[PDB]
Amino acid sequence: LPQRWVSAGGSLSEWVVALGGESKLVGVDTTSQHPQALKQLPSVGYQRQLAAEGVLALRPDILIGTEEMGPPPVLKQLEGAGVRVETLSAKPDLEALESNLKKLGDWLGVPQRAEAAELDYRQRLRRQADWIAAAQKSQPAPGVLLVIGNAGGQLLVAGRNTGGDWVLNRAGARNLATHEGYKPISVEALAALDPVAVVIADRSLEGDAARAALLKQNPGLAPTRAARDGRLLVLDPTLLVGGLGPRLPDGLAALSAAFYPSAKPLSTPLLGDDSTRTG
Amino acid sequence: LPQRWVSAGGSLSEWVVALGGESKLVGVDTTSQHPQALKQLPSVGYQRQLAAEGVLALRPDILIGTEEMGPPPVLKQLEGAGVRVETLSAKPDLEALESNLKKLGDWLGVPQRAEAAELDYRQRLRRQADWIAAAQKSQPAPGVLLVIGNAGGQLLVAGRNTGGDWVLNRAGARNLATHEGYKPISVEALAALDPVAVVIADRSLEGDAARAALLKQNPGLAPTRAARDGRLLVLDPTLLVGGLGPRLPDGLAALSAAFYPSAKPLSTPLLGDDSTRTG
Amino acid sequence: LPQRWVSAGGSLSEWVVALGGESKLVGVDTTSQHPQALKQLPSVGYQRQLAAEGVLALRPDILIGTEEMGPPPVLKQLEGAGVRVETLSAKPDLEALESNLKKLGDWLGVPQRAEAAELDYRQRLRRQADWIAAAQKSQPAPGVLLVIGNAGGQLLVAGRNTGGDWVLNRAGARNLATHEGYKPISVEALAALDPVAVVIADRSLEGDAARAALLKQNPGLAPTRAARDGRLLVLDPTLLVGGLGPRLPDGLAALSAAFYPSAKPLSTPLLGDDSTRTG
Amino acid sequence: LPQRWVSAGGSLSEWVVALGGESKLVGVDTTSQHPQALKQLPSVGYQRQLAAEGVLALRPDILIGTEEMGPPPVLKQLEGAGVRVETLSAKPDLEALESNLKKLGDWLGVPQRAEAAELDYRQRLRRQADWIAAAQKSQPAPGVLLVIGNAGGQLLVAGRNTGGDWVLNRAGARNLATHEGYKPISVEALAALDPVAVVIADRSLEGDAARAALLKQNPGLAPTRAARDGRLLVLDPTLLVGGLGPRLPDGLAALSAAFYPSAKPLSTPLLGDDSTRTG
Amino acid sequence: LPQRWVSAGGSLSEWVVALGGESKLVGVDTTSQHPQALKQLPSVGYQRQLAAEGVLALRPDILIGTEEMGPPPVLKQLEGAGVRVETLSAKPDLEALESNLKKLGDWLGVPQRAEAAELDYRQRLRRQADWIAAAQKSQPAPGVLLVIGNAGGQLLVAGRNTGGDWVLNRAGARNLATHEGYKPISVEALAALDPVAVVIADRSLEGDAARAALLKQNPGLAPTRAARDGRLLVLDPTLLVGGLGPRLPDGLAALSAAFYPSAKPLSTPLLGDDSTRTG
Amino acid sequence: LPQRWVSAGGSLSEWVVALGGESKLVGVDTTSQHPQALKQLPSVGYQRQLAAEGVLALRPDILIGTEEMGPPPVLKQLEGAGVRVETLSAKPDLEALESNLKKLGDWLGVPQRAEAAELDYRQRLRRQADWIAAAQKSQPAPGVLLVIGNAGGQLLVAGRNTGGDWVLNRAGARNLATHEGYKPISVEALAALDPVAVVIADRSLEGDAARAALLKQNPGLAPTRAARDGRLLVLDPTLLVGGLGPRLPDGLAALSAAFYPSAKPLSTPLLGDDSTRTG
Ligand code: HEM
Ligand code: HEM
Ligand code: HEM
Numbered sequence A, B, C, D, E, F: 001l002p003q004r005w006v007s008a009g010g011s012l013s014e015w016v017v018a019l020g021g022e023s024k025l026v027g028v029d030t031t032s033q034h035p036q037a038l039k040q041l042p043s044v045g046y047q048r049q050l051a052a053e054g055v056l057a058l059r060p061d062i063l064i065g066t067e068e069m070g071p072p073p074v075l076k077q078l079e080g081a082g083v084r085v086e087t088l089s090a091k092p093d094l095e096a097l098e099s100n101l102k103k104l105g106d107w108l109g110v111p112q113r114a115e116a117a118e119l120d121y122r123q124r125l126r127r128q129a130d131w132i133a134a135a136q137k138s139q140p141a142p143g144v145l146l147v148i149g150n151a152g153g154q155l156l157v158a159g160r161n162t163g164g165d166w167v168l169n170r171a172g173a174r175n176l177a178t179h180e181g182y183k184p185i186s187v188e189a190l191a192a193l194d195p196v197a198v199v200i201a202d203r204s205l206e207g208d209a210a211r212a213a214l215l216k217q218n219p220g221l222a223p224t225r226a227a228r229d230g231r232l233l234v235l236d237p238t239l240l241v242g243g244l245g246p247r248l249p250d251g252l253a254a255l256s257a258a259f260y261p262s263a264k265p266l267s268t269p270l271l272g273d274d275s276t277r278t279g
């Protein structure tokens, strides 16, 4: 069984730790910020732009990542250097998660723990769905948009078949975007969609800074119901990297509470609320 | 000499403390937040809406305030109740300051200290003006706007003969507003003015929250050079209440440094900087 | 259904938010500090001294408050201006609460949620009463006093039929005051009552500052068992404004734990404990 | 029943407070730091070196401590001065705890509460043992060492029949030390033992400072699996003074979670984790 | 020259560090809390009650302390064990300081630095005296009392020939106490003295907690001008242990500013101000 | 003159800001963390591994960096895309600095300010050198080592002609390394050198965490005088990237104070001190 692991992809790293493999992690990419301790480990750079020399320097027994791990030539030279490179799935669905956990469990030597993790996860999701069903008795599902930002610019809208879409659906909202994947869209169209709430995952900014930057670069969003009712929600971007992660259930609880404010929220930083208005 | 003082108007209160009369203050209005300890004294409400019963309860020997202290009927019933009511000047000029200090010094019994205060103040201002003169050798004075907000709404623009205008001029900027006093102006006109920087004094919000609210309610400001270059500066609103206060010199140093970024700033929380852009 | 709400009275505002009406609140009075976000909304001043021009500026569809909302002439001119003014009950009893929730639920469009709120509240109270019954098996109910202070002065003692009395009773204590309402009482009498504990709700001070101010202005309290055993408890004053609020249950848990120290406390900032003694 | 208590021995003090006797404590030794408020009470010095004049000055009705309370001559002169000196047991076992609680309950007048405390404690321990049994199905008990340090020096290893040994066993680990009591051992032997994890209870240092000091003065520990896998755990030293204390159950939950990382931890500052590695 | 030093007496330790001997300090007594790092060194207990075994364990080349270091028998057994024990002076005067610095400089090997330290110190004091002279032109020296407390109790008043008296005089105040040394005095007499300000050095409490405890145990102080004008100043107690220390000059600047509020304070945590009143 | 700048190399970015060009910076590499606001700008990745698509997305008018900016192919494709790529000097000497400032000043349009910056810098250095000369009268220059770490591993020692060497020399120390550039060296040799102090610049760790990691991976350093006397100094790594930066003067003041502890330090987070010992 591999003893020295290097992990690329936030959620993958969280899973390794969750399954008890923290002491086996010798290096991680920049999107791996949870738990907090992972930030103090050697860095191999961004997952989409791995540093070959960086991973080799750690004498890794295994390198794990998803489809979004690369570039391809660097991964190839790594394999040629004797490094065991595994590719898990970043797809936004339980089938993928259950498959990733199966593998991680095996390479870690804790197949039972991996099964228990899958079980607790689905249980959390079943509970989240039941809470939503009850909440929709007094309020219909709101139309929402999830956008990925870079200091408020270069907006990418989460369309169908993305982690962002999965998160919006699982939290009880209706994704207003009908396209596939993450794609840029004119603010004009976005404003026309008039979302009840907008979820912002910014790579560089957080809280009010993220909100302010968003409005600076996309003034058209100010006339949306989302901006008017103080519903520009800031989400922890790492929640969307490397496939479905262990913190999503807590994330869904916070989002669904914001989506159905007239319902007693579920029990249990990853979601900043808006305190400003427009009228 | 009066022993129990109640003060209405932020800057007036700061002066009493500055001259050593802190132990004589038994109550203050809500705009008196400096020094921090003044927030722990009994409150008589907002200066423009004093609570008669509130001041009487403190058995004050003297009540001080400016023209903006009121309403008139309440001040009258107070005088009729035997309370000594003094009215100082809130006018934005050294002549007024020097006159206010003269009186405060006398009622406090420290005429010499009051003179020294006037002297240090003007010295600070002379130094600020010389720094600006040198700074304008490599950069011309920027056109700027100062706005008073309420959670980003109900914008009042500081025109000529206001504390806001005095502050912009003393900090080396050109007030773009040509009207008199504080008046509401359409965002359309404001955006047309295209300020290099915008100074925001919000009664309820601070930092990025203030910026975000401002943009939400006034989307048109996003296309100004101010928003584009990350120059929506947030100023401590108390710096503009009750006439010229003792903290303005430090305030001018921060503003002038932001107005002439290519000059080594002057020596020495009251000014939050912008970190977002638009491009 | 009203879309823009202005609320006067801490507890009322908390309820609107609790029922999911936060995005409909456009302004609140100074006693509305919970949740924290409410402090960033436009302010209409103190509930007992509303600013007419202040509420009108917000174009409110409805203004809610209790009997303690005023003054009367200002509320009248508001009604004459077309503003819908509703008056709920501030009375210290479940009948009033259940009636306030009924109305809020209707004007908010969530009658079921309001019913669920009433249900959870009474359940919390039933649980608090059972815990007390069990706790009184090893210790008798302590005689206590609840005082409202202003920077430690102008003390008002909570007598019968006040929110303070309701809170003392519901927390398992015996209110030593036999008068009706909130009334000033000489420290001499208060010290004679010799409370086992004293609860202080100060408008301006908190923690040790509140304790120190209390003792400075009322030296006679130092010889009470309360002062001797380090039981000058500081309570969040907003818990007593605008009728019975949603945070009282958590407040009762903290108080009852302090009142019966030999009992395992109930599950779950609003109550500062004393660490000083006298002997 | 005694009204003024002076307590020597961290855990004893915690118990007095836990049973509701906080207002009866007029003084404590330096190892009594929990709850936090106990640090603000008069100090009688270190438990092993009590200040006679220090306790007498407090006019105590009773002085409680364990075998480790002294020196003997000082305790004697105290008894001769009329002070009631009680000696409880510091022995690392439930029989001793149950006997200490029995006495404290009686002198405090809350025999029932003391019984309930014993009951909750054993219940917590039964639950901890069951969790461990389940955790050992996928992982065998790890060999561990517990050391008491002084700014990383003067290391004492917890052998058999010590609170440290009790804590390691109850948390699911195997104490690698075979000696009796706390004894100094050469780092050479300690490194040879090659612990999977090392628990450090430092009197002066905490967190990374404690780790760094430990390695500075005992370089040989760097080659242990504990140092390599980032498992130099820092434990709150007060958890080991004055017999079995009320916080141990929470302490065991944290330790056992660190000892069996592949198990979902138990529900609920006293244990700092290691983030550094060696490879 | 000695390489391993153990120091008893706050101010002595500060001097060793100030002269550059920090790396030579291997242990200190509990009153040595400055700089902050000294708290992380091995502890030898309280200066007046040194732990023989504690110092020996550190293999010290030298042990330094003042007259207040003891007890005598422990110091004797230490000398008999080969430990070099030096006794400096704790007397409240420059002659003593200059003599202590002379010795420390020699044993540390930096005679010139010690001379420079004496020079800077006296210069600081000359500047403090000149500032006071100018301040007394508009205000006469206030009568003040300095008290040493233990969680607000066991009050010792600083009389003539004490560090407390030296500090009051050097800060521009008149010590109202006419006795010699530190002695207990009835609150009745203390209140009669009616100090303009009271300086409290509490061993266990700080800030408002110290104030509250003081008033609880000495209610009579509430009617003093000091309590009425919010002038119960809390001083860092370590400033008074082990003779004249390097932080006194900064301490004098803060005190003199509080004593002459109508004077612009001198340039540059050791003095907490009072925010409560009585009227 | 270029309006949109992207900067790679910490010190270069600091200079642009220092000269007043902050509003012209639209993106920076990961080593640009000062001022703090630069962390909120879009990221182009690590300087040695720039993201082509990342810079192009910002529509930059100019890209600045040093020799260490790359890789080469990416810079080439950038030039081919019309991006103006400038290469400044990272060499550790004033000639290089003065040349970089000359260029930055010109492209920014503030040649005079750039000259003033060069002037203030050299003045700071002249003052630092004079302070050292005086300090060496009572103490000889200490032999020191500066190491660059990665979570305490992969140690690179700063030899001749490196920013690390420049910093050690300018701070009054003697670099014990005789090799050229940054090179790995066995801990055996490093320990043999027996440095009086060791300066650690860790890419991932800070403070005690950095110290602990260093000792874990390099146990041999524990027997050095540096470890024994608590002189493992942690330096802000960004101070060594992108050539000589504006914060070095403050950095030199802190280091030289640590190198000559018996000298009164110079006036004015970038240097963490060691509090642990070995003996
Ligand atoms: C906080 C500042 C710094 C950060 C964030 C940083 C980050 C990185 C990253 C992400 C890598 C790729 C992974 C790896 O190979 O380790 C790297 C490589 C490297 N870094 Fe840095 N670095 C910093 C400071 C420095 C400094 C001060 C030096 C020392 C002169 C340095 C020298 C190197 C070297 C030699 C490499 C190898 C690859 C190459 O040079 O092309 N870095 N750094
Ligand atoms: C944090 C919450 C509170 C704030 C911010 C607040 C603030 C104020 C202010 C500004 C005044 C006017 C000045 C004065 O006359 O003292 C006032 C008056 C008054 N307050 Fe409050 N108050 C609070 C809580 C309470 C509570 C809990 C009570 C007790 C039942 C109360 C009873 C009164 C009374 C009796 C007056 C006299 C005037 C009147 O009742 O119309 N207040 N308050
Ligand atoms: C932090 C400081 C300040 C606080 C706490 C404060 C608070 C208030 C409050 C509570 C009201 C009543 C509600 C309303 O009508 O909006 C009010 C009204 C008003 N305030 Fe202030 N204010 C502050 C600063 C200022 C400043 C700097 C100006 C600008 C010159 C200003 C101008 C006004 C005006 C024009 C009104 C309308 C009513 C009147 O002027 O009589 N306020 N303020």
Ligand code: HEM
Binding pocket: D043, D044, D045, D051, D053, D054, D055, D057, E030, E031, E046, E048, E148, E150, E156, E182, E201, E202, E203, E237, E238, E240, E241
């Ligand atoms: C933060 C600094 C201080 C600490 C930590 C401290 C601690 C202690 C402790 C633990 C005791 C033993 C218990 C007792 O008898 O109360 C004690 C006793 C005593 N302390 Fe201190 N002390 C400090 C400052 C002072 C100061 C400034 C004075 C005043 C001149 C002082 C005068 C005394 C006296 C008179 C005793 C009685 C026993 C004797 O003097 O031998 N202490 N102290």
Ligand code: HEM
Binding pocket: D030, D031, D046, D048, D148, D150, D156, D182, D201, D202, D203, D237, D238, D240, D241, E043, E044, E045, E051, E053, E054, E055, E057
């Ligand atoms: C935070 C808690 C603790 C504090 C504040 C503390 C403090 C002290 C002090 C001040 C001394 C005297 C100086 C010396 O000889 O080192 C001492 C001695 C000693 N301590 Fe503690 N201690 C603590 C925890 C412990 C623990 C958990 C043990 C381990 C079983 C322990 C065992 C000893 C021993 C063996 C001595 C030698 C003298 C004797 O036992 O009589 N201490 N301690």
Ligand code: HEM
Binding pocket: A030, A031, A046, A048, A148, A150, A156, A182, A201, A202, A203, A237, A238, A240, A241, F043, F044, F045, F051, F053, F054, F055, F057
């Ligand atoms: C906190 C987490 C994240 C960090 C630290 C991060 C960082 C980066 C960096 C440094 C770049 C290179 C510069 C650039 O082209 O902008 C980049 C590119 C990119 N990132 Fe991320 N990223 C994060 C999250 C995400 C998420 C959630 C998405 C959305 C699905 C995403 C999608 C992309 C895309 C599409 C690119 C373009 C290049 C490519 O895909 O190969 N990133 N990111």
